[PDB]
Scaffold this active site. Sequence first.
Site, PDB file in Angstrom:
ATOM      1  N   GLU A  73       0.472  -0.953   0.048  1.00  0.00           N
ATOM      2  CA  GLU A  73       0.463   0.280  -0.364  1.00  0.00           C
ATOM      3  C   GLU A  73       0.421   1.582   0.252  1.00  0.00           C
ATOM      4  O   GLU A  73       0.583   2.645  -0.623  1.00  0.00           O
ATOM      5  CB  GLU A  73      -0.818   0.102   1.009  1.00  0.00           C
ATOM      6  CG  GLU A  73      -2.061   1.508   1.656  1.00  0.00           C
ATOM      7  CD  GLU A  73      -2.727   1.667   2.597  1.00  0.00           C
ATOM      8  OE1 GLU A  73      -1.619   2.439   3.144  1.00  0.00           O
ATOM      9  OE2 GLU A  73      -2.786   1.035   3.148  1.00  0.00           O
ATOM     10  N   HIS A  74       1.891   0.624   0.568  1.00  0.00           N
ATOM     11  CA  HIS A  74       3.065   2.322   0.140  1.00  0.00           C
ATOM     12  C   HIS A  74       4.004   2.076  -1.077  1.00  0.00           C
ATOM     13  O   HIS A  74       4.074   3.532  -0.852  1.00  0.00           O
ATOM     14  CB  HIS A  74       4.017   1.911   1.716  1.00  0.00           C
ATOM     15  CG  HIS A  74       3.781   2.587   3.228  1.00  0.00           C
ATOM     16  ND1 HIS A  74       4.051   3.502   3.501  1.00  0.00           N
ATOM     17  CD2 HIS A  74       2.927   2.179   3.534  1.00  0.00           C
ATOM     18  CE1 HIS A  74       4.072   3.731   5.000  1.00  0.00           C
ATOM     19  NE2 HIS A  74       2.769   2.857   5.095  1.00  0.00           N
ATOM     20  N   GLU A  92       5.794   5.169  11.530  1.00  0.00           N
ATOM     21  CA  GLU A  92       4.270   4.653  11.668  1.00  0.00           C
ATOM     22  C   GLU A  92       3.305   3.791  12.391  1.00  0.00           C
ATOM     23  O   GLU A  92       2.335   3.820  13.389  1.00  0.00           O
ATOM     24  CB  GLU A  92       3.484   4.494  10.019  1.00  0.00           C
ATOM     25  CG  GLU A  92       3.613   5.137   8.873  1.00  0.00           C
ATOM     26  CD  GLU A  92       2.820   5.278   7.975  1.00  0.00           C
ATOM     27  OE1 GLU A  92       2.493   4.081   7.808  1.00  0.00           O
ATOM     28  OE2 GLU A  92       2.193   6.378   7.145  1.00  0.00           O
TER      29      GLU A  92
END
Lengths: 422, 108, 49, 101, 271, 442, 59
Positions: free
Chosen positions: F58-59, F135
């Site tokens: 997703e990054h 994160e």
Amino acid sequence: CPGAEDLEITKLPNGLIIASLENFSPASRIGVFIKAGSRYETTANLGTAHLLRLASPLTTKGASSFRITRGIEAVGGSLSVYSTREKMTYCVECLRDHVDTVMEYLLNVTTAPEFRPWEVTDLQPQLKVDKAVAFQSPQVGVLENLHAAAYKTALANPLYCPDYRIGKITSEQLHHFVQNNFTSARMALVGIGVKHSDLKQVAEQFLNIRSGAGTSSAKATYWGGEIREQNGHSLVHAAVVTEGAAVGSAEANAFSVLQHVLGAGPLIKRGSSVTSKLYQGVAKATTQPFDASAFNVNYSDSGLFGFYTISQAAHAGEVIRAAMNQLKAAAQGGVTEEDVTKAKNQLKATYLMSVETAQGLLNEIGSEALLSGTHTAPSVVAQKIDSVTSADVVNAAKKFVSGKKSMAASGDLGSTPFLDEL
Amino acid sequence: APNIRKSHPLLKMINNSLIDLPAPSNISAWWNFGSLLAVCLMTQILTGLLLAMHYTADTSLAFSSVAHTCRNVQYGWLIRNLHANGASFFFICIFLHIGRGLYYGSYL
Amino acid sequence: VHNDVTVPDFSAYRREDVMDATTSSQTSSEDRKGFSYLVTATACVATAY
Amino acid sequence: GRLMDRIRKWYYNAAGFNKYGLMRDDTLYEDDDVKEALKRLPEDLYNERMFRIKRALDLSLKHRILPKEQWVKYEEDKPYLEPYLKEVIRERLEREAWNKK
Amino acid sequence: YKETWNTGVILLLTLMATAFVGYVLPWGQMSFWGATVITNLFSAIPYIGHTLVEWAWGGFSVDNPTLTRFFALHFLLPFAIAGITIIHLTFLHESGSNNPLGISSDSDKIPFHPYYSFKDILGLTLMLTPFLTLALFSPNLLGDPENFTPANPLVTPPHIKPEWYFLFAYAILRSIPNKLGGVLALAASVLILFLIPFLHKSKQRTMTFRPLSQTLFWLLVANLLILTWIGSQPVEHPFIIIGQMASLSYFTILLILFPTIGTLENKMLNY
Amino acid sequence: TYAQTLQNIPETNVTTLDNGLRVASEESSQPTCTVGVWIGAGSRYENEKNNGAGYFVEHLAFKGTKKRPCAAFEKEVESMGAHFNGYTSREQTAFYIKALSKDMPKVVELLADVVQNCALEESQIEKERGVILQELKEMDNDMTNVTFDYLHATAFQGTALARTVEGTTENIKHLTRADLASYIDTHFKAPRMVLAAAGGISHKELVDAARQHFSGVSFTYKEDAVPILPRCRFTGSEIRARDDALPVAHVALAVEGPGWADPDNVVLHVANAIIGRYDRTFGGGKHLSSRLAALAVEHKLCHSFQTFNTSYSDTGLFGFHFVADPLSIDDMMFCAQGEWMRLCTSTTESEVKRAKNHLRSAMVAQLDGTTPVCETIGSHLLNYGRRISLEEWDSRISAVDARMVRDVCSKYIYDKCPALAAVGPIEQLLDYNRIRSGMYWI
Amino acid sequence: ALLRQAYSALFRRTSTFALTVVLGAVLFERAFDQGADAIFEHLNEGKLWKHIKHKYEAS
Ligand code: HEM
Ligand code: HEM
Ligand SMILES: CSC1=N[C@@](C)(c2ccccc2)C(=O)N1Nc1ccccc1
């Protein structure tokens, strides 16, 4: 079997504007827009507008505190109140078949409040709580100081009741405020998922607090001050602005575009903003996490324009200076003709997406239907926007580098530069 | 208070000593004799009353009233055994209770 | 971080019917409870007696 | 005619709470409704009520009453709490009615 | 103060049982026969009656097993009274005392000591004089001479009358000539006390400012005086009728007049 | 009227490109629109070695493809005023774009390029490795999310649903360019994806650009095969993370839920509607219809509380979550469990009537804009294999009554062993046994 | 599925659990007394008046 529809908009003799629209959505969303806010407060009644906002659920001449809450919840409805320094909106949402029910309350709340002393006394400690959660976002704190440095009056007043006044606001103060601001010529009854004949009927047959322009607000005088809150946080939030354009001011779009040209928020998740002059420029300067954006606000008789940054404490200096250069550079023709084309896209897109949600649409209609009892076609607005030369933009950029600036910063300001070192 | 177990002036007491009472997670069987002693007490009293209701305190009738109890009173003999042995049970438990106390320094 | 936290293994204690991680534990719940509650109801009977 | 009024004035004087300087409303038993109403009284009305009561309790312990000239007069008795009390009961019944489906 | 009141009623009932079982112990004529009249009241209860009575007696009539168990009970109950007193006072402290004006006293309270400790010691010695005067100068003023005669199962005294503090209740028991009806009347004569809290209609707590209720209150007191008197007389005209009147007005004042007058008084205050 | 508006809503159109992909879209008259691809993938499909891969992907799904490197990809998207967002959960992933209907086709090309030709720049990977690690430290201070992770960690201990979406520290420090690559290939496959779009778009024009960029067809039957995941065992238990240094405590309690396809979910949602939710800023205060909310206000039981019915393919979590001061935990838990009992035992018609209305406007609110409507479509086909109209939902909601609520709730709640997660200053929260007892009679 | 059936019908509802404990005690008592009384008399055959009685009974 429903289809298309018109965006009607009457305007009764007393000056009350009525704008409706039928999109046949199963959900209706009515609202009462008003020209009121902390802007109309003076030293003596500071925060009264904040409390008035929280006072929406108190008993009225027609409904009791209890029935207002129970009644609306009875039909899965909702009641909220949003407000800016200069406008207040009271809106209710609910399934179509309940517009009648929910209406009685919206009416009572905005036109028949009783501000019972005891109820008011009990509610005031809430201002502390409300204000406490709001202030968790550093954003909110510096924007308060920003307006306090930008102006000397009206728009300088905070959006959240100052501490020394929590518990000191009175019922007379709330009544006088509603009497001198919630006047038929400063209000607009906007609605969605409804029929104009219906909404129109409710207004005239029920809205009684009468006409006038009520107490007018003092003119916004620019100050260009500088407020620095040293609180030790690892991150430093800072905003530098200049008197920008007013609402309707032709010079508006110019800034809107210069805004998108500089960098008005991210478009890609976790992505970098290449189409962002400002971000890209700051990025080249520091290695650590940060954030820079073009700040832009348009009020009735004034506005503010500049950039807002967020950075580690040690690199606050370079990050803010880097943001400045991107503004000078833009003021010195450093703006492509293609940049202005792209920005005009992002601007047209943004505006167009803004109206996807019922809240955004109703707000668009109402806002304009309040500041000029009319409605610009989404084409005329687009027409007005793209018809903005690269000259205009470079000029806006100049007005900034040349105009007097006001700054507000919070955090460990040990390395944050002073306004006179920019 | 939202729940009676805590607000009521009487339940509050039962709650603070037999329901919500904080107790060490690791107390052994040597910590059982306290409640056993309490039950002996309630037991001795109960059987004692039952016996008292047929007893006669006079040197000429004592011995025989006890005999009358064990021989004629329904379950008289049972009640008398339970009372007589209950007293022993009571002392067994009090001696262990004390021992526990000395060993674990409860006397502090 | 909390991501690095996992519940230990309770196989040395789990009842036979909930030993397998890929099997619904709901199908053996009423039996697992019915049994335990049976013991209790029985003690109540003996006690009442 | 003035029968009811005559009667009420007789009772008022017969009751005698006015000999302690108390208003009719000062003598109400503080049940739930009354307690809530009291909380709505304006500062001054509340402090005045308090003094009258503290003063009456003093008279009670001394086994005295006020000099006949300070006794409250039937027509000067101020029903300071009744208005509030009525609203309170009115609200309670509303909730009660509404909570019955 | 409902819980304080209710435990209070339990205390009265317990004190009464105590006095009853205590009075049997000397075993004189009055002890025996009164214990016979009272225990036989329970036989009025349908179905289980006869069974409960013989159970209580430990035989077919008041006898030795009744005496020894009564002694044990008399020895025990006073302690149940002491224990329940603690509960009484515990509920009371949740609110503290009421006062003669029936209005909150939070604005004027004082430490129990020395104000009431002294006031109470004074009250003690004031009531101790009559007690001791009676006890030392008229030991038998309140007792039946019949109890100086050993219990005789074969001879019943001509006039079986109870101790003064149970007379009014006795009068009520006799008002209803029907065995079971009299028991119920008696039961109710005391259990009615549990109902008092629900018959309060006044907007004011005390009767201090309620002249009509005050008259009604003294009528009740006088009514109890009459019942006491009637309970000491033989069942014969005019007593029988006077007795039924008093019994009837006793229940009437408590069940009807008090709440009725209470409402009537609220209206005269314009409430 | 209301009913009419529900019937007149444009139908959702669906078509399948025999390569396995489904294309669905709801048409309106808006100059703006949202289109995206909803993939049936997540952390549940991962395992001990590649946990957090889907997140790692997703990054990068936005840092450039093969046909166009980073800068190029970004500039192109930015320069057209389109917004590019996405997310990855336990059983579902999605990448979607907001823009002018006038570009629906160019966007479809962009999406396809993202899901098919991710550059997976070896250097970008090491750069994101450090970002993801930052994160995880940020999210570690999000008690609410730390609490729901723990709830899954214990409720589904030993299984796949027990892992967090972001993945382990070790995994993030060692995932290889090959692993991510493997992940994408193994999971981002046509039959397990959905091209959804909403706004002013031609279904046929959408399906066409779809055929053009999502073309690769399958030959065998196993290429049209959507792998059924192994069951995840629910476990009544508790995990207690204590830190009296934290200002407030978070608590979450739940029982196993049915799973998407089950009709009972309509009732569980009505049930949760009765209990509702609350937070210290609800003006309604002590008059709120939600009994638990009212009590919270009166006794100051908590800062906030919320009910939830988290569904999955074959299981789910039905429970509630609250934040409270260390000294009001016990009373809050007490009232909360109390309301759950009242549900199974004494729910009223008036109660459901209100809860039904609240639920209707709740569903209608989840279709407020193109993105949320697009999200409904992606999710519906992916979970029910079809779109479910507001009219159907309304039809189902209308059938619910008090009796039904009690029966269904008694079914999933009454006398069940719950899953408990508590974080912060939780010394006052009583033991499992006591909480277990709160599961019956009331 | 006895444990399962038992749970749903008897042990689930606190009310039914109570009725089960009552009838259970009733049945248990009858059975336990008779059984215990047998075991005792069996261990003492020929010694109880129950056993001897017939010899002198002559009513
Ligand atoms: C701490 C509790 C008690 C203890 C330790 C205790 C102990 C004893 C002992 C040692 C005996 C002699 C038993 C024998 O005959 O060999 C006895 C006798 C007796 N006890 Fe208690 N007792 C207790 C409480 C009571 C109470 C509360 C009562 C009655 C209200 C009571 C009444 C009797 C009676 C009547 C006897 C005489 C009859 C008999 O000996 O069996 N006892 N008790
Ligand atoms: C053994 C019997 C009793 C004892 C030892 C006892 C003791 C007390 C004590 C110590 C007080 C506080 C002082 C006072 O106000 O007098 C009190 C108060 C009270 N008792 Fe009792 N009491 C007994 C029986 C009863 C009975 C029979 C009733 C009523 C049926 C009763 C009703 C009350 C009540 C309502 C109060 C509140 C007094 C107030 O208005 O402040 N008591 N009692
Ligand atoms: C043991 S006889 C008895 N116990 C007394 C003290 C009593 C009875 C009822 C309640 C409390 C106290 C009482 O007056 N009597 N006498 C007696 C004489 C004739 C008829 C009834 C009782």
